[PDB]
């Protein structure tokens, strides 16, 4: 399906690493859909060039420019920069349906069956289960919806200062309507939950399809030993970090190196 | 409705305090249903007598006795004692539909509308959102269901060592079926979530109808100043603890005192 795609975002080089790993993981699990990534001018040329190889489409978004539709809203609420940039995922009208995934997520299995879902489908957020986690969600690109979201960001802002607060406010019937719009937790497994409720992780964690690396320390912030093939504890959670690093080590770094020549 | 009731449980005197506060809170918010409480022989006579005043019905359960239906299962899995005692809520066939509530919960508003729900309806558990939290749930008493649950406890036990693991295993279609069986999080608000996702609590916490005191330190473990009417920090969470203590101070203690004469 050329009209459907997975979409991610990177506003700097650190998250670009995440996006490259994410995109590679989707290729690894043979998705039949297109891969697109939103990028900002702050992403270095070498990183953008790597993204052009992994992703089918690289879209540049610069909300800092007066010409951008979200710029005016940005001036009003500057703390929503990342959010407003992410909302541009709805401007990708070349696609009929997409699955947005933050650059700090990792695909562990084919999840093309997510395209059978309707907007707005997302997994429950741990912490406050009646809000969905915005790390992974099925949506339909639309200039109308995009403009509607910008209007809410402008008028109300976000209750949590992030894109998750804004998205939950706009798509507020999620908790009480249509069980099909509740994506199983394994489609966006919070790396945090592998502690808050370990018994449940032990019981159902083996079915994880997507891992969402939350917390201050992102995957790229860890130290990885290529010999033992494991991150340094310097947790029941290393298993996922090691997958991320194996892909980074095996496919992403070799790729970034071919640019030196 | 004399055929419907709220049901709780207390296996000792500490939780009996919780049950008395819970029952009082339900009376405070004028429930039209009956109030029932499961008790064990370990609850002192004075506490049982207090329970007989607050609750419409006090049922004694002693799984330690060979005559109890759950005894055999208890010998097999002794760590499930509390769970097996709680399962006896399904033996209350004098009721057609009930809302079970753990003794460490607190009602903040009338929640009689829960009786419009079907078994098994429960709110999402923070931590692992695809499991429901067993602190509050709508069920239908039935010897058949009770026996079926005992069979699962005997054969598989509980993945989390508690009643929540067992209930989720038996009522396993909850996460993927019928959005109406997902009780809003405000019907069983985890006291923990008032930190894990404070922004969400600030945004929707004001609508809390039931608070579930989780964590090692229960409400009765805190020190309460009757003058300032607030617990001692010795948190955005005190508001709920103070309600609990106000009811305990105002209605429960005065009640327990009338037994000295």
From Swiss-Prot, chains A, B:
GO MF: glycogenin glucosyltransferase activity; manganese ion binding; protein homodimerization activity
Q: In which pathway does it act?
A: Glycan biosynthesis; glycogen biosynthesis
Give the reactions, separated by semicolons, that this protein catalyses.
L-tyrosyl-[glycogenin] + UDP-alpha-D-glucose = alpha-D-glucosyl-L-tyrosyl-[glycogenin] + UDP + H(+); [1,4-alpha-D-glucosyl](n)-L-tyrosyl-[glycogenin] + UDP-alpha-D-glucose = [1,4-alpha-D-glucosyl](n+1)-L-tyrosyl-[glycogenin] + UDP + H(+)
Keywords from the UniProt entry = Acetylation, Cytoplasm, Glycogen biosynthesis, Glycoprotein, Manganese, Metal-binding, Nucleus, Phosphoprotein, Transferase
Q: What is its EC number?
A: 2.4.1.186
Q: What is the effect of changing residue 163 to S?
A: Loss of self-glucosylation activity and 18 to 30-fold reduction in its ability to trans-glucosylate maltose. Reduces UDP-glucose hydrolytic activity by at least 190-fold
Q: Which residues carry this modification: N-acetylthreonine?
A: 2
Q: Which GO terms describe its cellular component?
A: cytoplasm; nucleus
Sugar-modified residues: 195
Q: Which family does it belong to?
A: Belongs to the glycosyltransferase 8 family. Glycogenin subfamily.
Query: How is this protein named in the record?
Result: Glycogenin-1
